Amino acid sequence: LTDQVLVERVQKGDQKAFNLLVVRYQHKVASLVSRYVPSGDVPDVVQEAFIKAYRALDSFRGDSAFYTWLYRIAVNTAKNYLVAQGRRLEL
DNA sequence: TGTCAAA
């Protein structure tokens, strides 16, 4: 089961295939997100990143490895979190 | 909104 096979399966309606991608990548994504947001907020941001990746998977062209695309989604989700945090903290 | 080398 390569990432590409799992992605193809999800794009064909096999939702549970995506759970294998989450199991494969959640530790890496948490580590990445922890570079950007406070430790207590990492799980929330990681969860959002994975939901966004899943819901946008139909638009993923496969012009990179899945993880390359997911990595950038995670970074940008963290960045959006920081913008929202700035607003809430009146920065 | 999009995020597509890899990381």
Side-chain angles (χ1 to χ4, degrees):
Chain A
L1 297 175
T2 62
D3 292 349
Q4 169 65 307
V5 164
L6 291 172
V7 166
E8 301 294 85
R9 287 171 55 176
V10 175
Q11 292 172 329
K12 294 187 282 197
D14 185 10
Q15 303 97 336
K16 55 182 53 178
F18 194 81
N19 185 71
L20 298 173
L21 291 171
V22 175
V23 174
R24 280 181 186 184
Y25 290 112
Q26 63 186 342
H27 292 267
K28 283 185 171 299
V29 172
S31 175
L32 176 59
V33 167
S34 81
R35 303 171 188 174
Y36 292 90
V37 308
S39 56
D41 299 313
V42 171
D44 183 46
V45 176
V46 170
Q47 192 148 205
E48 185 183 7
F50 278 110
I51 295 169
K52 289 167 64 68
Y54 176 66
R55 296 191 173 186
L57 201 63
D58 60 348
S59 71
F60 174 57
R61 296 189 305 274
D63 288 343
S64 66
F66 169 76
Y67 183 64
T68 294
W69 183 78
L70 178 62
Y71 182 113
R72 188 55 50 189
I73 295 176
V75 171
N76 289 334
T77 302
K79 288 177 178 179
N80 301 342
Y81 168 96
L82 294 173
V83 172
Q85 176 177 251
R87 299 192 207 294
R88 294 177 89 263
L89 292 176
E90 300 175 310
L91 304 185

